[PDB]
Design a protein around this ligand. Structure first.
Ligand SMILES: [Ca+2]
Ligand SMILES: [Cl-]
Length: 471
């Protein structure tokens, strides 16, 4: 439950938000595999409500567990799991199991969603499968949070043997199709007791998709816990990982100057975070990039955003997830679509960025460069920590990688990188290409020391070098 089940030499999960199965399959082969990414978190693959204007949020109102959505059908889904797994890239399903719809309608596969009478024929679910209607309105009351309707969404009763069976069957069907695990939506709104039973009923991963024998599905739970509520993220760590929301708030604040970088010296549980092995971390997610408030860094504030991502990828704490967004100006805005409501696929430009309105943060050199960094430093700890007692910090990951940051002033120092002597290509400003560095290079001397210079006025506020990008 806490092992991502990544293939060897890979790291990070990319949230390919609103992507189609065919496109994800292509991406696994053409980019994710070559760049060393470990997995993809897909948008909900089960039938969901068709809402006016086709907003991104319609995916979070389940109508049934039929695999037929704007992302594709089941055959498209299996083509994706086959191809991604063959390319060593795992698939994680966004499991929306706390509720059904908040309104009447029809699903993406034509199924009826009777919110009013609490009837979802395609499952089927009837009124007896839901908690008696009430509104979630008191986060200081755990039972209110778990047993009532979150914003009018019919609340499933996972205490029911019937409901548990339906959910287990759905998730097991996904495992059969080659998925590696699940992002559990609105875990805070469900009881750990019910969740443990459900999770325990999941079968081992399908070895026909390349998984090791006895592999268990990776479980990472969305428990938005910023403290001071009746429910704690600690209640969920017993049976799977938990998405660490304090991580992004704290880093977002720090990299925006709300705190001095020197303070990150003891980054980890001391900052009130979960223990690393229990955490899945990220700078921003699909929800908080829209309504996270000012503390959250997103693609719209590029420089500090990339720094935060670089710190996340360079630091040994947790399993890392990278957001891949579609450009938006309105919080309700759905992904790029044609006149019939069909999704427009991301295209790849001649500079390797995405066309058609997709931001593709995962394709940013600074992001994939750092995924490469994380792979090169596997097994190391933070060493050679340095800081100017203000906003300049640097540290090595064993003797395999070195990273430096400045959120204040020019960094010009000779630092012990702990790396072997040689010329290294900074993977932020460029990369090792054709036996040369396309960007900045750093020369490390015999004693591991090197002259690090990173001006505060450069496009990026981070420099990163590792043994896999050495001349
Ligand atoms: Ca609930
Ligand atoms: Cl999330």
């Amino acid at each position: 439950q806490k092992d991502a089940n990544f293939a060897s030499g890979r790291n990070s999960i990319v949230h390919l938000f609103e992507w189609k199965w065919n496109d994800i399959a292509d991406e696994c082969e053409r980019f994710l595999q070559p760049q060393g990414f470990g997995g993809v978190q897909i948008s909900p693959p089960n039938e969901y409500l068709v809402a006016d204007g086709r907003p991104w949020w319609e995916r979070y109102q389940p109508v049934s567990y039929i695999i037929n959505t704007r992302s594709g059908d089941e055959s498209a889904f299996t083509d994706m799991t086959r191809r991604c797994n063959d390319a060593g890239v795992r698939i994680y399903v966004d499991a929306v199991i706390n509720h059904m719809t908040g309104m009447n309608g029809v699903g993406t596969s034509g199924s009826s969603a009777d919110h009013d009478g609490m009837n979802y024929p395609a499952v089927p679910y009837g009124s007896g499968d839901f908690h008696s209607p009430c509104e979630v309105n008191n986060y200081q009351d755990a039972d209110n949070v778990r047993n009532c309707e979150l914003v009018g969404l019919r609340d499933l009763n996972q205490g029911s043997d019937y409901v548990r069976g339906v959910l287990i069957d759905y998730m097991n069907h996904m495992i059969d199709l080659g998925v590696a695990g699940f992002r559990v939506d609105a875990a805070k709104h469900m009881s750990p007791g019910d969740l443990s039973v459900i999770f325990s009923g999941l079968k081992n991963l399908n070895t026909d998709y390349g998984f090791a024998d006895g592999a268990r599905p990776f479980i990472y739970q969305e428990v938005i816990d910023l403290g001071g509520e009746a429910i704690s993220k600690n209640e969920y760590t017993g049976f799977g990982c938990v998405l660490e929301f304090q991580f992004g708030v704290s880093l977002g604040n720090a990299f925006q100057g709300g705190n001095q970088l020197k303070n990150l010296a003891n980054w980890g549980p001391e900052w009130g975070l979960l223990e690393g092995l229990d955490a899945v971390v990220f700078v921003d997610n699909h929800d908080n990039q829209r309504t996270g408030g000012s503390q959250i860094l997103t693609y719209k504030n590029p420089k500090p955003y990339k720094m935060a991502i670089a710190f996340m990828l360079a630091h040994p704490y947790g399993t890392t997830r990278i957001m891949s967004s579609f450009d938006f100006t309105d919080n309700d805005q759905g992904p790029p679509q044609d006149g019939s409501g069909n999704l427009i696929s991301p295209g790849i430009n001649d500079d390797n960025t995405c066309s058609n309105g997709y931001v593709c943060e995962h394709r940013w050199r600074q992001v994939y460069g750092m995924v490469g960094f994380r792979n090169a430093v596997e097994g190391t700890q933070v060493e050679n920590w340095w800081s100017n007692d203000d906003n300049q910090i640097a540290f090595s990951r064993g003797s395999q990688g070195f990273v430096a940051f400045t959120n204040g002033g020019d960094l010009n120092q000779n630092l012990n990188t702990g790396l072997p002597a040689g010329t290294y290509c900074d993977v932020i400003s460029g990369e090792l290409s054709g036996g040369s560095c396309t960007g900045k290079s750093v020369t490390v001397g015999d004693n591991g020391s090197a002259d690090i210079s990173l001006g505060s006025a450069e496009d990026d506020g981070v420099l990163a070098i590792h043994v896999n990008a050495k001349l």
